[PDB]
Design a protein around this nucleic acid. Structure first.
Ligand code: FES
Ligand SMILES: [Mg+2]
Ligand SMILES: [Mg+2]
Ligand SMILES: [Mg+2]
Lengths: 100, 32, 43, 40, 153, 177, 99, 162, 161
RNA sequence: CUAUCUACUUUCAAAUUCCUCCCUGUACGAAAGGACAAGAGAAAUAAGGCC
């Protein structure tokens, strides 16, 4: 039949005027994702006489290389990673208003 | 001596009053 | 094969745990869009 | 938007002109008593 | 491998001993510079893909220097290679058929008489000099980038 | 939706990865779509101060098609900064030198002229010829439709379609052709 | 002085934001902003831009219905334009009259 | 269709033509009053540069245009189709209507710059080094002016200059 | 073999947009009654949770729900605690259905009640015009009367049919 | 300029030129006349360095 919009996403919309014609009624139930359209949850992942060692993977990196790594990882420019002076740091409100 | 600039209101008037030629529904050459 | 809940997460484990919380909210009738508490004077 | 269409239906070009949306009372008392007429 | 047209073999690092007069059978005088190869070895080989260049690279080292004045990381590199540390390390762009095993010594007979060679080195440092010595010199509202002014020569 | 507050916020502002095919597409129409996605202007939650831009991946940038004679006529000009450093090259010359330059410049001009523009460009991934790194391929969420419909070539027409079209004129049987 | 003048800009920018968000929400349903706003008026739906932007974010199902209603009214306008007026007006085209 | 041939046999060459049946026009044109084929089929202002099915009928096997007298097209449509065929060729829509490659020529691959609606031959056009001021801006032609009268299904007329 | 207005298929022969056929009026009128009845039964059986509505109040439109607060930008000649009914409801919505007025829904269908919880004035608003004088000492300050309304409840009645 | 600010302080190194010889009394040239590059030597300038 005729649909104003496709009904394969978000919800199925049925538009109907009332008999008097003064009210528009919209029936929009949710469209549940079909099981077929889903993927299975990805499953995560010797002479070891000595205990396993929790080697610290914390490597020192200089500011330039460290900022370059952060910028690449988050797809940002380098500027945001540099610090700012005391004047701006103290200006920031550390008890901002919160709405719900 | 050179075509002087017109007041833009006048230029707007000229454009709105430009000749519009009649367009036949069927081209004359396309008819017997 | 019938969806009961769906949840978002930054990791698959976090999303799976959130989905469980969403399912529990629906089962216990404590969803975010449930009928609000009625304060109308008894009548 | 819709100013010319509204005029074609005999309505005010602005939906805030004449009609139920503007002229009708905004509110009434919960018990059903009518509110005082609005200043506008 | 045999030499093929389009091949680029490695070069070497030499020390500048000085200059001497040389005469040719046509009776012309020529001043030459004596370049002495001291403890020159191949240090590293990098293939075309890994070098980020069209041609593969061969790293060559120069004069032997004290191990007591070198960084730990550099000292570890030479420890694996089995050679005393070098003073200068240069990169030569080579073809895949000119690759030499790291550690191989390079000699002056790598070049032969009658051949031409480009020689690269740091020039004698003259410090901060004026336009006259630096450039030989005795209005858009700004100085152009690249303008010749006094500076380190 | 009865999500937990933190998960709900994460989903609403999450970054999406979009794929765009540039084969036989004009750069500007590709740039116009990429501009909107890189700014987050396609989201109802859009706000300039909210960093709600999305990732845009454009492939086949080498196979873009310029309408008209823009290959010859369109000139890209830059200045090195030195006396006599002004350089002007045509779109064709620039395309051979850098297959992604034309699409990149088209997007750069459309983005807002503010400090957020360079950040938006970081989320732009231009690839010349159908090869996308596996990591970027795993991010992809949706492929946006090509802005220009690629007309079929004469050879690409099926016999049924060729027959369906009528023969407009009767050629003289004595004409060499 | 800036504070006094900014009140004018605040209203202007807020309306620009609602239109941007409504445009984005409409595009998700294949509808251009002028089609949605104008056709909703032709259905005697007087929801303002601020509410429509709020609905797009917090009531997506209701907003899709509004987009579907605008799309339906737009199609009824197309059919009427092709017709000579002999046929009857569309169901959603019918305008309620007030006196 | 007359195909001239030549056969060298017995130390002699014979040149003769061969008359072959041609594609007959589809019967019952919708508008038999139309003077030329385009109007006879209600195709005036209804074809573009990418309608190879329509344009291919008026071009030779090697991409050349056919004479107006042979085709019967009116001068106005003849020029329209002539421009459309030029743009169709420059866009690669007609890859089988090119001159046959002899044994001497070698297969070669050169920069293939995709283009469409190309009014001018790429070689003749010169770069716009100086755009000029806003009031006197040098524009880039897109499409052809001959197709300015084509049916438009949008509220905006075609932009012929970019 | 062709009609008088037949045109061979080409790019410009027909419009680019896909042809749309609207439902038959008679058949569609029957379908509308089924949808209105279905939604009416949901209201009759209370098959809805939280409701939201769009109300027109003080020249303004408010997307509200139960327990919400709205700051009205003027006085309302009402005592704090007074319970009023917001009588101009453009829209009332549920999870699965939405009712739209043309332009206002009937009073029978939806009832929205609110309470006045605070009567106050806004924070001082500076008015400063840069006329050709010493401006600072000539700054005007205005405070506007405000009223805070709490949305108590939104009730829909089964009167669609 | 007792120089606060703007700008700038290595676009690192593809080189130009005039003469002589040669090509050549050759190609062209009715003929006279007379190449061009290809080179060779010698100069100078500029750029870069060097004792
Ligand atoms: S005479 Fe009708 S289109 Fe040519
Ligand atoms: Mg020194
Ligand atoms: Mg305004
Ligand atoms: Mg010197």
């Amino acid at each position: 039949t005729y649909s104003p919009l496709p009904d394969d996403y978000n919800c199925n919309v049925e538009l109907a005027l009332t008999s008097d014609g003064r009210t528009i009624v919209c029936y929009h139930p949710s469209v549940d994702i079909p099981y077929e359209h889903t993927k299975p949850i990805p499953r995560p992942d010797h002479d070891q006489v000595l205990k396993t060692r929790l080697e610290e993977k914390v490597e020192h990196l200089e500011e330039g290389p460290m900022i370059e790594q952060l910028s690449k990882m988050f797809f940002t420019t380098k500027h945001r990673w540099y610090p700012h002076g005391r004047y701006h740091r103290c200006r920031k409100n550390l008890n901002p208003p919160k709405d719900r | 001596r050179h075509r002087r600039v017109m007041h833009f209101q006048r230029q707007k008037l000229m454009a709105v009053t430009e000749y519009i030629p009649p367009k036949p529904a069927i081209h004359p050459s396309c008819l017997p | 094969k019938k969806l009961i809940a769906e949840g978002p997460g930054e990791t698959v484990l976090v999303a799976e745990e959130e989905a469980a919380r969403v399912a529990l909210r629906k089962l216990y009738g404590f969803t975010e869009n449930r009928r609000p508490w009625n304060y109308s004077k008894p009548k | 938007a819709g100013g010319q269409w509204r005029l074609q239906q005999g309505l005010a070009a602005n939906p805030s002109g004449y009609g139920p949306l503007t002229e009708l009372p905004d509110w009434s008392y919960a018990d059903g008593r009518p509110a005082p007429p609005m200043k506008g | 491998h045999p030499w093929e047209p389009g091949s680029f073999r490695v070069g070497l690092i030499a020390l500048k001993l000085g200059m001497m007069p040389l005469w040719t059978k046509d009776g012309q005088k020529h001043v030459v510079t004596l370049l002495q190869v001291q403890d020159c070895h191949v240090l590293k080989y990098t293939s075309k893909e890994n070098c980020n260049g069209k041609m593969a690279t061969l790293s060559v080292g120069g004069k032997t220097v004290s191990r007591f004045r070198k960084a730990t990381s550099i000292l570890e590199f030479y420890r694996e290679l089995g050679l005393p540390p070098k003073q200068t390390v240069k990169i030569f762009n080579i073809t895949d058929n000119a690759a030499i095993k790291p550690g191989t010594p390079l000699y002056a007979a790598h070049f032969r008489p009658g051949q031409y060679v480009d020689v690269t080195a740091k020039t004698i440092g003259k410090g901060f000099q004026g336009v006259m010595k630096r450039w030989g010199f005795k209005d858009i509202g700004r100085v152009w980038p690249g303008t010749k002014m006094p500076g380190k020569m | 939706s009865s999500f937990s507050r933190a998960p709900q916020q994460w989903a609403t502002f999450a970054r999406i990865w979009y794929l765009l095919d540039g084969k036989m597409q004009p750069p500007g129409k590709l740039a116009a779509m990429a501009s909107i996605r890189l700014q987050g202007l396609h989201k109802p939650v859009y706000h300039a101060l909210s960093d709600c831009g999305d990732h845009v991946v454009i492939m086949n940038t080498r196979h873009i098609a310029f309408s008209g004679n823009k290959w010859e006529q369109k000139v890209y000009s830059s200045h090195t900064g030195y006396p006599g450093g002004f350089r002007q090259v045509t779109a064709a010359q620039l395309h051979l030198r850098d297959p992604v330059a034309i699409v990149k410049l088209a997007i750069y001009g459309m983005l807002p002229k503010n400090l957020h523009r360079r950040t938006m460009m970081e989320r732009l991934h231009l690839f010349p010829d159908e090869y996308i790194p596996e990591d970027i391929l795993k991010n992809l969420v949706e492929e946006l439709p090509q802005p220009r419909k690629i007309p079929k070539r004469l050879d690409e027409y099926t016999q049924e379609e060729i027959d369906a079209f009528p023969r407009l004129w009767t050629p003289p049987e004595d004409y060499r052709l | 002085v800036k504070c006094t003048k900014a009140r004018y800009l605040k209203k202007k920018n807020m309306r620009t934001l609602w239109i941007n968000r409504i445009t984005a929400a409409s595009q998700e349903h294949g509808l251009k902003y002028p089609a949605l706003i104008g056709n909703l008026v032709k259905c005697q739906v007087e929801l303002n831009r601020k509410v429509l932007a709020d609905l797009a974010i917090y009531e997506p199902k209701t907003f899709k219905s509004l987009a579907a209603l605008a799309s339906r009214r737009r199609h009824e306008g197309f059919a009427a334009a092709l017709g000579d007026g002999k046929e009857p007006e569309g169901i959603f085209s019918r305008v309620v009259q007030y006196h | 269709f007359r195909e001239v041939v030549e056969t060298q046999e017995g130390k002699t060459t014979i040149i003769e033509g061969r008359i072959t049946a041609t594609p007959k026009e589809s019967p019952n044109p919708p508008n038999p009053s139309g003077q030329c084929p385009i109007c006879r089929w209600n195709l005036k202002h209804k074809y573009n540069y990418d309608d190879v099915l329509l344009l291919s009928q008026f071009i030779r096997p090697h991409g050349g245009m056919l004479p107006r007298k042979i085709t019967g097209l009116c001068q106005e449509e003849h020029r329209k189709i002539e421009e459309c065929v030029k743009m169709a060729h420059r866009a690669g829509l007609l890859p089988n209507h090119r001159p046959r490659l002899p044994e001497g020529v070698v297969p070669k691959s050169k920069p293939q710059l995709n283009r469409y609606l190309t009014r001018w031959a790429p070689g003749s056009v010169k770069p716009i080094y100086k755009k000029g001021p806003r009031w006197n801006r040098v524009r880039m032609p897109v499409g052809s002016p001959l197709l300015r009268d084509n049916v438009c299904y949008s509220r905006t007329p075609w932009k012929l200059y970019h | 073999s062709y009609l008088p207005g037949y045109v061979p298929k080409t790019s410009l022969s027909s419009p680019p947009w896909p042809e749309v056929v609207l439902p038959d009026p008679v058949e569609e009128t029957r379908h509308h009654a089924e949808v209105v009845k279905k939604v009416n039964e949901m209201i009759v059986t209370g098959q809805y949770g939280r409701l939201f509505a769009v109300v027109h109040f003080a020249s303004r439109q408010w997307k509200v729900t139960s327990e919400d607060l709205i700051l009205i930008g003027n006085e309302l000649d009402l005592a704090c605690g007074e319970r009023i009914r917001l009588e101009k409801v453009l829209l009332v919505g549920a999870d699965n259905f939405t009712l739209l007025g043309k332009p206002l829904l009937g009073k029978d269908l939806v009832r929205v009640e609110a309470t006045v919880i605070e009567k106050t004035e806004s924070w001082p608003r500076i008015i400063m015009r840069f006329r050709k004088r010493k401006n600072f000492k000539k700054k005007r300050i205005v405070t506007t009367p405000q009223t805070v309304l709490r949305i108590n409840s939104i009730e829909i009645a089964p009167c669609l049919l």
